[PDB]
Design a binder for this molecule. Structure first.
Ligand SMILES: Cc1cccc(C(=O)Nc2cc(-c3cnc4ccccc4c3)ccc2N2CCN(C)CC2)c1
Ligand SMILES: [Cl-]
Length: 304
């Protein structure tokens, strides 16, 4: 069983490298962030450009949606995160506290907290309503590449160039688990599975790994792509077949069968490193986004 993702739309508009694409929880919208300091909103089903959101003083590495598809948070080189009202485009809060570039961000499912990771080697947990920093976790000893809440928001997973992936108790800020590798290549990406039982982690040695969080055991490895420089975002695809989806430094989107680990599709068309991919919440739709020699987002659709 293989997917048949085919190109549907190419979304042009960003004037510099695109860093992150995310589908709204309600499936309605795609948000993109870019080195051009802009957030753009696009229709998920027709690819139609909606609006430009601006205010960051420097490039934006990441953007994430609240549970109600009404708010966005962005992580910038200007050392801030911003919370935005999607419908008005207005900046609601500026989250200040990191001492350097902010690279990654997420709302908890309840969408009252935001977690961020920074070049400053810390993970911060912020109050959505007030914008105040609630906790600063001495998370890592190198830049933090990814931060993600599990399904009930009770855990955070973080990854860093220090070679570790850590799991944190949200309430107390205590580290519950460290995943260590003997060679410790930089961990460039991490995310929980939809059910929260597993973690998917990328390392900068051309490798994706599925870890049993509960047991601390690697269950799967996914290879064949190129990933030795960029923090490339990867995904579980669960709407049709059960896939792993990633960008790659050879300008392709890679799709693997989660259980067998076999490459099932490679998506051709981008003209630069595919740094971001997103999987639609309800439909078999992938968004992909590439760096400065491409600057476009592509939307792909499959029957399974
Ligand atoms: C504005 C913009 C546009 C296009 C790409 C990037 C970028 O690549 N992001 C970034 C950078 C780094 C990073 C930068 N310096 C570093 C210096 C020393 C050691 C480690 C470092 C890690 C880490 C993460 C990230 N991201 C990539 C996009 N992703 C959605 C979240 C995380 C940003
Ligand atoms: Cl995500």
């Amino acid at each position: 069983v293989k997917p048949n993702y085919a190109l549907k739309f190419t979304l042009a508009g960003h004037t510099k490298a695109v860093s992150s694409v995310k589908f709204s929880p309600n499936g309605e919208w795609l948000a993109s962030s870019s080195a051009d300091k802009l957030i753009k909103i696009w229709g998920a089903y027709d690819g139609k450009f909606e609006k430009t959101i601006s205010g960051h003083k420097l490039g934006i590495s990441d953007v994430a949606w609240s549970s109600d598809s009404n708010l966005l948070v962005s992580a910038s080189d200007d050392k801030t995160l911003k919370i935005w009202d999607v419908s008005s485009g207005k900046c609601l809060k500026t989250l200040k506290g990191h001492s350097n570039y902010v690279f990654c961000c997420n709302f908890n499912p309840q969408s009252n907290l935001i977690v961020s990771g920074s070049f400053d080697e810390s993970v911060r947990i912020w109050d959505v309503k007030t914008g105040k920093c609630l906790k600063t976790l001495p998370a890592h000893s190198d830049p933090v590449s990814a931060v993600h809440f599990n399904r009930d928001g009770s855990l955070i997973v973080s990854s860093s160039y220090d070679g570790l992936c850590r799991i944190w108790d949200t309430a107390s800020g205590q580290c519950l688990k460290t995943l260590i590798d003997d060679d410790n290549p930089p961990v460039s990406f991490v995310k929980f599975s939809p059910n929260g039982k597993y973690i998917l982690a990328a390392t900068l040695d051309n490798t994706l790994k599925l870890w049993d969080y509960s047991k601390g055991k690697c269950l799967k490895t996914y290879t064949g792509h190129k990933n030795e420089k960029y923090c490339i975002f990867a995904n579980f695809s669960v709407t049709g077949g059960k896939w792993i989806v990633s960008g790659s430094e050879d300008n392709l989107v890679y799709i693997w069968n989660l259980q067998t680990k076999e490459i099932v599709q490679k998506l051709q068309g981008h003209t630069d490193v595919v740094i971001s991919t997103a999987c639609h919440p309800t439909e078999n739709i992938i968004a992909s986004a590439a760096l400065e020699n491409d600057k476009t987002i592509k939307l792909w659709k499959s029957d399974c």
